[PDB]
Design a protein around this nucleic acid. Sequence first.
RNA 1: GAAUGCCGGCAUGAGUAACGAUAAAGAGGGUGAGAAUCCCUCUCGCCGUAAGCCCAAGGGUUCCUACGCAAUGGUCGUCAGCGUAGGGUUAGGCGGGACCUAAGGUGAAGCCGAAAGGCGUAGCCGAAGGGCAGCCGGUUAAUAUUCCGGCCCUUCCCGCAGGUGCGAUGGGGGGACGCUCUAGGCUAGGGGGACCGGAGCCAUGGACGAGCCCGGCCAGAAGCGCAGGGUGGGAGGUAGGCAAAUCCGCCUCCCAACAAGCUCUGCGUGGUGGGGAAGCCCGUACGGGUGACAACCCCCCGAAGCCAGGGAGCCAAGAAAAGCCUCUAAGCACAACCUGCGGGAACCCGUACCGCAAACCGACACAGGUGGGCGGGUGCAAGAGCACUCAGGCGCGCGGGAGAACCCUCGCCAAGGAACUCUGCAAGUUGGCCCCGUAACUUCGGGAGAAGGGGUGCUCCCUGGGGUGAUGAGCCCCGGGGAGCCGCAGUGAACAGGCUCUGGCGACUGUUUACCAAAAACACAGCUCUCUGCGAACUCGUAAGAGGAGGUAUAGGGAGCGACGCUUGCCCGGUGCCGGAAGGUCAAGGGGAGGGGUGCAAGCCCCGAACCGAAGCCCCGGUGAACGGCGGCCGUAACUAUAACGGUCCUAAGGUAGCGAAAUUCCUUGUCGGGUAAGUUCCGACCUGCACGAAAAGCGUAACGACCGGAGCGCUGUCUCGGCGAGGG
RNA 2: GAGCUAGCCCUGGCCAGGGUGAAGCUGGGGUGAGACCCAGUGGAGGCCCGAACCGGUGGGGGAUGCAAACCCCUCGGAUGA
RNA 3: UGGUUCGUGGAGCCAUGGGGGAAUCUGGGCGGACCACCGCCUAAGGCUAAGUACUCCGGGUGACCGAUAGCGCACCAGUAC
RNA 4: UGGGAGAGGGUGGUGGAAUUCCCGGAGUAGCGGUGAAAUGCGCAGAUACCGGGAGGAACGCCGAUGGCGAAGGCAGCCACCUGGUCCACCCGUGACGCUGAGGCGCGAAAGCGUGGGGAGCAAACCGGAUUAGAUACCCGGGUAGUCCACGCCCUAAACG
Lengths: 47, 272
Amino acid sequence: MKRTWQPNRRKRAKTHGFRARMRTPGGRKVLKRRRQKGRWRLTPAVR
Amino acid sequence: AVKKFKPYTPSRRFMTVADFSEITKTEPEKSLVKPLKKTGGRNNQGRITVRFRGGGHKRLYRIIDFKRWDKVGIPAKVAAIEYDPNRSARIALLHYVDGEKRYIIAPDGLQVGQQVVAGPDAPIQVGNALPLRFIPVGTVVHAVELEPKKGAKLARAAGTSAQIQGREGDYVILRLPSGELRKVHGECYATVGAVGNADHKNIVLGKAGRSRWLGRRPHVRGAAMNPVDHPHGGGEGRAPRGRPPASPWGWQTKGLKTRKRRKPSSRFIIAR
RNA sequence: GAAUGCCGGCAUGAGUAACGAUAAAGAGGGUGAGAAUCCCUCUCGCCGUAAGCCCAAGGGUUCCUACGCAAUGGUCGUCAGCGUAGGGUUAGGCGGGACCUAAGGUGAAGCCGAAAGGCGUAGCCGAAGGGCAGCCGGUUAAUAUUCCGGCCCUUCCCGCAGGUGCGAUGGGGGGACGCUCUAGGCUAGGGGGACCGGAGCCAUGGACGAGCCCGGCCAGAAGCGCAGGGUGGGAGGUAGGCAAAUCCGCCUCCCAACAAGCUCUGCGUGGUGGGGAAGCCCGUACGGGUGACAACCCCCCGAAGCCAGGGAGCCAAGAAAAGCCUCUAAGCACAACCUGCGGGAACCCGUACCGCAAACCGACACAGGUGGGCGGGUGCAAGAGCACUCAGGCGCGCGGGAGAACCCUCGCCAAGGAACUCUGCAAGUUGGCCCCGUAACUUCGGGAGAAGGGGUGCUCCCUGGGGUGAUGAGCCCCGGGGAGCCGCAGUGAACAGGCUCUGGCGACUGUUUACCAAAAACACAGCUCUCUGCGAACUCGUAAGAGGAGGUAUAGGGAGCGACGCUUGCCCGGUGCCGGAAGGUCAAGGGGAGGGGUGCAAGCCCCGAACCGAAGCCCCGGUGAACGGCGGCCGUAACUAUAACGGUCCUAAGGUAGCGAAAUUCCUUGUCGGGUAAGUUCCGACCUGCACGAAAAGCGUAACGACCGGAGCGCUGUCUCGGCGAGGG
RNA sequence: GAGCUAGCCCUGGCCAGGGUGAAGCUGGGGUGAGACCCAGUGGAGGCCCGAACCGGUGGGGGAUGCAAACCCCUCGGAUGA
RNA sequence: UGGUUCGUGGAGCCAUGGGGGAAUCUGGGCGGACCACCGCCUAAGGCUAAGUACUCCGGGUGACCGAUAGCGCACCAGUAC
RNA sequence: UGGGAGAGGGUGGUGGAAUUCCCGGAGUAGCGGUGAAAUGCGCAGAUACCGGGAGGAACGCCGAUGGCGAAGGCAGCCACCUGGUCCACCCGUGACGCUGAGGCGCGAAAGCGUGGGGAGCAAACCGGAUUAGAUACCCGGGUAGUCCACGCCCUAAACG
Ligand SMILES: [Mg+2]
Ligand SMILES: [Mg+2]
Ligand SMILES: [Mg+2]
Ligand SMILES: [Mg+2]
Ligand SMILES: [Mg+2]
Ligand SMILES: [Mg+2]
Ligand SMILES: [Mg+2]
Ligand SMILES: [Mg+2]
Ligand SMILES: [Mg+2]
Ligand SMILES: [Mg+2]
Ligand SMILES: [Mg+2]
Ligand SMILES: [Mg+2]
Ligand SMILES: [Mg+2]
Ligand SMILES: [Mg+2]
Ligand SMILES: [Mg+2]
Ligand SMILES: [Mg+2]
Ligand SMILES: [Mg+2]
Ligand SMILES: [Mg+2]
Ligand SMILES: [Mg+2]
Ligand SMILES: [Mg+2]
Ligand SMILES: [Mg+2]
Ligand SMILES: [Mg+2]
Ligand SMILES: [Mg+2]
Ligand SMILES: [Mg+2]
Ligand SMILES: [Mg+2]
Ligand SMILES: [Mg+2]
Ligand SMILES: [Mg+2]
Ligand SMILES: [Mg+2]
Ligand SMILES: [Mg+2]
Ligand SMILES: [Mg+2]
Ligand SMILES: [Mg+2]
Ligand SMILES: [Mg+2]
Ligand SMILES: [Mg+2]
Ligand SMILES: [Mg+2]
Ligand SMILES: [Mg+2]
Ligand SMILES: [Mg+2]
Ligand SMILES: [Mg+2]
Ligand SMILES: [Mg+2]
Ligand SMILES: [Mg+2]
Ligand SMILES: [Mg+2]
Ligand SMILES: [Mg+2]
Ligand SMILES: [Mg+2]
Ligand SMILES: [Mg+2]
Ligand SMILES: [Mg+2]
Ligand SMILES: [Mg+2]
Ligand SMILES: [Mg+2]
Ligand SMILES: [Mg+2]
Ligand SMILES: [Mg+2]
Ligand SMILES: [Mg+2]
Ligand SMILES: [Mg+2]
Ligand SMILES: [Mg+2]
Ligand SMILES: [Mg+2]
Ligand SMILES: [Mg+2]
Ligand SMILES: [Mg+2]
Ligand SMILES: [Mg+2]
Ligand SMILES: [Mg+2]
Ligand SMILES: [Mg+2]
Ligand SMILES: [Mg+2]
Ligand SMILES: [Mg+2]
Ligand SMILES: [Mg+2]
Ligand SMILES: [Mg+2]
Ligand SMILES: [Mg+2]
Ligand SMILES: [Mg+2]
Ligand SMILES: [Mg+2]
Ligand SMILES: [Mg+2]
Ligand SMILES: [Mg+2]
Ligand SMILES: [Mg+2]
Ligand SMILES: [Mg+2]
Ligand SMILES: [Mg+2]
Ligand SMILES: [Mg+2]
Ligand SMILES: [Mg+2]
Ligand SMILES: [Mg+2]
Ligand SMILES: [Mg+2]
Ligand SMILES: [Mg+2]
Ligand SMILES: [Mg+2]
Ligand SMILES: [Mg+2]
Ligand SMILES: [Mg+2]
Ligand SMILES: [Mg+2]
Ligand SMILES: [Mg+2]
Ligand SMILES: [Mg+2]
Ligand SMILES: [Mg+2]
Ligand SMILES: [Mg+2]
Ligand SMILES: [Mg+2]
Ligand SMILES: [Mg+2]
Ligand SMILES: [Mg+2]
Ligand SMILES: [Mg+2]
Ligand SMILES: [Mg+2]
Ligand SMILES: [Mg+2]
Ligand SMILES: [Mg+2]
Ligand SMILES: [Mg+2]
Ligand SMILES: [Mg+2]
Ligand SMILES: [Mg+2]
Ligand SMILES: [Mg+2]
Ligand SMILES: [Mg+2]
Ligand SMILES: [Mg+2]
Ligand SMILES: [Mg+2]
Ligand SMILES: [Mg+2]
Ligand SMILES: [Mg+2]
Ligand SMILES: [Mg+2]
Ligand SMILES: [Mg+2]
Ligand SMILES: [Mg+2]
Ligand SMILES: [Mg+2]
Ligand SMILES: [Mg+2]
Ligand SMILES: [Mg+2]
Ligand SMILES: [Mg+2]
Ligand SMILES: [Mg+2]
Ligand SMILES: [Mg+2]
Ligand SMILES: [Mg+2]
Ligand SMILES: [Mg+2]
Ligand SMILES: [Mg+2]
Ligand SMILES: [Mg+2]
Ligand SMILES: [Mg+2]
Ligand SMILES: [Mg+2]
Ligand SMILES: [Mg+2]
Ligand SMILES: [Mg+2]
Ligand SMILES: [Mg+2]
Ligand SMILES: [Mg+2]
Ligand SMILES: [Mg+2]
Ligand SMILES: [Mg+2]
Ligand SMILES: [Mg+2]
Ligand SMILES: [Mg+2]
Ligand SMILES: [Mg+2]
Ligand SMILES: [Mg+2]
Ligand SMILES: [Mg+2]
Ligand SMILES: [Mg+2]
Ligand SMILES: [Mg+2]
Ligand SMILES: [Mg+2]
Ligand SMILES: [Mg+2]
Ligand SMILES: [Mg+2]
Ligand SMILES: [Mg+2]
Ligand SMILES: [Mg+2]
Ligand SMILES: [Mg+2]
Ligand SMILES: [Mg+2]
Ligand SMILES: [Mg+2]
Ligand SMILES: [Mg+2]
Ligand SMILES: [Mg+2]
Ligand SMILES: [Mg+2]
Ligand SMILES: [Mg+2]
Ligand SMILES: [Mg+2]
Ligand SMILES: [Mg+2]
Ligand SMILES: [Mg+2]
Ligand SMILES: [Mg+2]
Ligand SMILES: [Mg+2]
Ligand SMILES: [Mg+2]
Ligand SMILES: [Mg+2]
Ligand SMILES: [Mg+2]
Ligand SMILES: [Mg+2]
Ligand SMILES: [Mg+2]
Ligand SMILES: [Mg+2]
Ligand SMILES: [Mg+2]
Ligand SMILES: [Mg+2]
Ligand SMILES: [Mg+2]
Ligand SMILES: [Mg+2]
Ligand SMILES: [Mg+2]
Ligand SMILES: [Mg+2]
Ligand SMILES: [Mg+2]
Ligand SMILES: [Mg+2]
Ligand SMILES: [Mg+2]
Ligand SMILES: [Mg+2]
Ligand SMILES: [Mg+2]
Ligand SMILES: [Mg+2]
Ligand SMILES: [Mg+2]
Ligand SMILES: [Mg+2]
Ligand SMILES: [Mg+2]
Ligand SMILES: [Mg+2]
Ligand SMILES: [Mg+2]
Ligand SMILES: [Mg+2]
Ligand SMILES: [Mg+2]
């Protein structure tokens, strides 16, 4: 049966991308939590 | 008149399609007019406002001239009576002698070859738009503005007709198809004659298909719902609504007058 | 020492279930220390509209080669999609970007929002939509429309050559479009050949023969040829395409009325270029050589593909922008632009491998899921079905024996056929084509495949039509008629409805509880009520704003019923709604009679009664396809019985038509009849309706239903009543 | 967080092969002209059968499964909501 | 209406959103409704270190821990998953 | 050939009296109804008076015991189209005539389908009065219907 994860680099990068997080003020604060705790990947590595 | 169907299959015994014989042999439309894409939509900023609207055949909007005073005193000859899917009323082409091409609402009796003139002149017979300060009392008229220089806003649907009953100074009273006697300005333009194709009521959709093809999605009865969404909804088998018939937002839907009573346009209204 | 406590370790179950589709294995020869599992050969089996090839996503070294087997592989392992190391992805023409725009997003101008932020015509972003220039072979272990070979093309930049008023984000043409059904000519693909070329082979009884088997193509500029698409041409006037305009549009006269001509495609032909089987010999895991001066010819079927913007019909009425052409304005007419010929320049990213799967998503080498294209041959009427089989790829990563019970899956059965049982649940019968042949009823279409029957193979003869070859042979389609043969059986295997009567409910096609409910539930056309005069009513939002709708009473919203036929009676006392500038009550405000507190005083500050004060509520009317409701008792007619009738109490009024033990009836298996031998179910009636009833509609209604209930015929392991046999455990 | 799922917008694609034979049109009959009735063409439909496809009706298996929704036989739709 | 202990309480004072709406020292505010006396300041413009709070970093100390503790990590950790 | 009469029929246009509703002016204690009253309307200002607007159905006098048509039926007026009928001439055709089973056409009112229109009248229906009772005759209201376009009904005291 069709499961929940049907990958797409386009949807992943337009949704959880850095340029999508820097626009919204909620997403800008998302990067503050990841930098101050020290995440190695602030945004999901999309290729 | 319309043509019925033999019941070769079900939903055809009742389905009746209109008469397409008055349409001239001009099935494809004319470009340089209608280059607008109809913005097919159902919501404003995503959230649905008008419920049960969707589907529907793809259409193209034909830009219609409602400002007939742009070419006052300039005659125009019709050469095509076309079908407009954005309207119940048919349309007609206007090949002006000036050279401009424009779509106009096609009233009844407007045949090919007849020419149409606009302005305070242009005698009384179909198509000729005149301001209400010059149209004779007791005549059939349509495409009426309510306020000057704003465009035709009254009696644009099929078969509708407006009749002049009197005069009040610079204002002229009108008998609208709903029966309202509204006092509109005399300088408001109006096109004589009845809109025609009065047989739009006489058609029968036959099945649910034509509703979906027109774009009307299924209308869910409010009693089949549940109390969180609709007031009528809930209870056991076939709730007899148990309260005054209301709408999903709580307001009553049977006999509650909703116009504003403090409206400044109420002093130009007489009847129902 | 305990909290179904937290973390870690090891037991029990236990050498038990399982080892992941029943598509299937066996032998011989190699390597190796170790082979059922790796390599090679032979035999066997499976898929073959895939279980085979080619793309787009996603995955991101998995590809190739050398060396390995500690871990991964449901066993082994010398193997690998695993470990170590090296190599491999080459583009002006393929795809994407220095091209365009749609939904949507962003957003200068402008509007809004306590802040964050939100809307927003123009502009921009935004794509398997438009536009654009490459086809065929060869090489590597791994790449190729990318490298090589042949042939053909596209942009710019600079020069001479010939022409012209050139000339833009601006104007106009064009780009430009639906669904169904189809004509003409071609191509892909395929069938045949007594024609051509082939190593070879006569086997086991016969056959040296028009014998068997294999193969008889691909691309290809310019001209040609065939088919097809787009297009009229002048001459005036002109107030319109938001400046100008010879372009476009509109009016008039002329010749075309054609596709003649001018263009643009497709296909065939074409200088030249390439491929080239089966069999045998080799040694690769795989390629090579030869067969090879290889032939490369003729018929037939022939598309859903090409000419493409073809044609006809229909209504539900079928994107935008740029590339291209034309027009002109500032400018410039030593410029610039068009055609043609040279020389030069042509960037950035991907190309490997998987890709109905062991590499994507499902924790797994998971029987699940995944978009497009090719998808051969024969037979069954056909077809992408079904059975077998080319090319290709596999035997699904535990096996060997045995032949218990028991379970799954499958086959057969005496005699009876529903007695089993909630129910023929399951299973079984029928089953495809052709020809007879059909009922009540009905909305005249249907019901209809009704039901129910007959023919179906092969051989011989006579014979009719088409289509392609010329008005003939061959080839390919359908027939018609007459003789005869075999078997139990002729859609001989596979795929390919059991039927009839009636009732409930819903008109019908559909839709839904992903993962227990596909239904009488939802929806549907259709009917009614009600709101709504356009800055509409209503919805979302604090607002701007947007939907409605670039709609305008034949339109839009809400509510109810839910096709169609006949109908929807009474109550407006209560509630809702509608209409009522009277009256009562009614808060802030006006108003100050009068009174108070302070001071020596003017003054200052409080209360503060009549009187005028809106909406609402009360009051008066109307409204039930609005919320809702729609009685009881007693007595009377000449066999009894009953009550057409009369009287009385109360409510605002006191169920009409139609139906009725019902999806509604408790008593109740009401009672009569029909069915059965036997009928708490079923059907037709009576009415005593606990507790039907007219739009939460009433009564019927042809057709339809994987809905529900009852009966019957054919049929069977469903049962008396079980027995046996196969495969997987 | 709408890569599952529900609806809608923009743009593309897919539905083999058989039947049924509406309207229209041509010819004939017919009338004063029609209406209308026969053939022939025609190819309509939320039409019939049935694969891909989309579902998930009935039964059996499965139940620490191949599977946290599966498999076999059967079944509904398959030019349209 | 908010703030202050202040919740309408006799509700002042300090800010205000709405309506009306003056004066320049014999002018105004306050001293908890209001009035008189007596006293305190002189509003509707603004600037200002010091002393005060905190620990990403460095140092010192510890009747603080010692790999199931101590920060989530003494170890290439906000990693693998 | 030449004239005539006629409410013959179909379409379009158009006029006035009156009813009803609305707006305005002015006016007060009732109006209405019947054999009699009552329901009802009326201090929230009605009936009656005047002015203006709206809308529909019928056409007063002429108008008749009249006319026209096969029948049902047909009345303000104008215009268009087309029936039928009468008179004078003796011209033409030369019996071409009469009736008519079946068929076809028309066919009042009421009724049915779709849509419009709806002033008045008015089945069903509410209320008052009458009567012993009154599902009625009388009175206050009131829907379908009366009208129009098309389609269907196709009956009758369709009666000379
Ligand atoms: Mg354009
Ligand atoms: Mg938007
Ligand atoms: Mg948004
Ligand atoms: Mg519900
Ligand atoms: Mg609620
Ligand atoms: Mg109930
Ligand atoms: Mg309820
Ligand atoms: Mg109730
Ligand atoms: Mg109103
Ligand atoms: Mg203890
Ligand atoms: Mg312990
Ligand atoms: Mg433990
Ligand atoms: Mg053990
Ligand atoms: Mg055990
Ligand atoms: Mg055991
Ligand atoms: Mg075992
Ligand atoms: Mg296995
Ligand atoms: Mg297995
Ligand atoms: Mg071996
Ligand atoms: Mg070794
Ligand atoms: Mg096979
Ligand atoms: Mg095959
Ligand atoms: Mg990729
Ligand atoms: Mg992976
Ligand atoms: Mg690797
Ligand atoms: Mg490999
Ligand atoms: Mg190993
Ligand atoms: Mg192992
Ligand atoms: Mg495994
Ligand atoms: Mg490896
Ligand atoms: Mg560039
Ligand atoms: Mg770009
Ligand atoms: Mg763009
Ligand atoms: Mg846009
Ligand atoms: Mg924005
Ligand atoms: Mg925005
Ligand atoms: Mg925009
Ligand atoms: Mg493209
Ligand atoms: Mg390209
Ligand atoms: Mg080429
Ligand atoms: Mg490869
Ligand atoms: Mg020159
Ligand atoms: Mg130029
Ligand atoms: Mg240019
Ligand atoms: Mg343009
Ligand atoms: Mg052909
Ligand atoms: Mg070829
Ligand atoms: Mg061929
Ligand atoms: Mg051959
Ligand atoms: Mg040879
Ligand atoms: Mg022999
Ligand atoms: Mg051949
Ligand atoms: Mg010109
Ligand atoms: Mg101009
Ligand atoms: Mg000129
Ligand atoms: Mg060619
Ligand atoms: Mg050739
Ligand atoms: Mg060769
Ligand atoms: Mg190989
Ligand atoms: Mg196709
Ligand atoms: Mg095409
Ligand atoms: Mg076309
Ligand atoms: Mg652009
Ligand atoms: Mg100049
Ligand atoms: Mg560059
Ligand atoms: Mg490549
Ligand atoms: Mg490749
Ligand atoms: Mg598969
Ligand atoms: Mg799983
Ligand atoms: Mg495996
Ligand atoms: Mg798998
Ligand atoms: Mg997997
Ligand atoms: Mg698939
Ligand atoms: Mg595929
Ligand atoms: Mg094929
Ligand atoms: Mg085949
Ligand atoms: Mg065949
Ligand atoms: Mg098969
Ligand atoms: Mg059998
Ligand atoms: Mg037996
Ligand atoms: Mg037997
Ligand atoms: Mg039997
Ligand atoms: Mg029994
Ligand atoms: Mg038993
Ligand atoms: Mg029994
Ligand atoms: Mg049963
Ligand atoms: Mg069964
Ligand atoms: Mg059989
Ligand atoms: Mg019968
Ligand atoms: Mg029939
Ligand atoms: Mg039947
Ligand atoms: Mg049969
Ligand atoms: Mg025979
Ligand atoms: Mg034989
Ligand atoms: Mg022949
Ligand atoms: Mg036989
Ligand atoms: Mg089967
Ligand atoms: Mg069948
Ligand atoms: Mg039934
Ligand atoms: Mg019944
Ligand atoms: Mg149903
Ligand atoms: Mg159907
Ligand atoms: Mg069906
Ligand atoms: Mg579903
Ligand atoms: Mg479910
Ligand atoms: Mg869920
Ligand atoms: Mg659930
Ligand atoms: Mg179903
Ligand atoms: Mg608006
Ligand atoms: Mg709001
Ligand atoms: Mg409505
Ligand atoms: Mg219902
Ligand atoms: Mg019903
Ligand atoms: Mg009722
Ligand atoms: Mg009431
Ligand atoms: Mg009342
Ligand atoms: Mg009340
Ligand atoms: Mg007061
Ligand atoms: Mg005093
Ligand atoms: Mg009041
Ligand atoms: Mg007696
Ligand atoms: Mg009685
Ligand atoms: Mg009754
Ligand atoms: Mg009963
Ligand atoms: Mg009985
Ligand atoms: Mg039983
Ligand atoms: Mg019964
Ligand atoms: Mg009874
Ligand atoms: Mg009752
Ligand atoms: Mg009921
Ligand atoms: Mg009801
Ligand atoms: Mg019934
Ligand atoms: Mg029925
Ligand atoms: Mg169904
Ligand atoms: Mg069903
Ligand atoms: Mg058995
Ligand atoms: Mg056994
Ligand atoms: Mg066995
Ligand atoms: Mg989605
Ligand atoms: Mg396909
Ligand atoms: Mg026919
Ligand atoms: Mg169908
Ligand atoms: Mg199932
Ligand atoms: Mg189910
Ligand atoms: Mg099961
Ligand atoms: Mg069967
Ligand atoms: Mg079926
Ligand atoms: Mg089907
Ligand atoms: Mg406070
Ligand atoms: Mg306070
Ligand atoms: Mg203030
Ligand atoms: Mg004070
Ligand atoms: Mg004090
Ligand atoms: Mg100051
Ligand atoms: Mg400061
Ligand atoms: Mg400071
Ligand atoms: Mg400080
Ligand atoms: Mg630790
Ligand atoms: Mg330790
Ligand atoms: Mg008056
Ligand atoms: Mg006459
Ligand atoms: Mg009548
Ligand atoms: Mg009627
Ligand atoms: Mg009816
Ligand atoms: Mg009366
Ligand atoms: Mg009356
Ligand atoms: Mg009649
Ligand atoms: Mg009779």
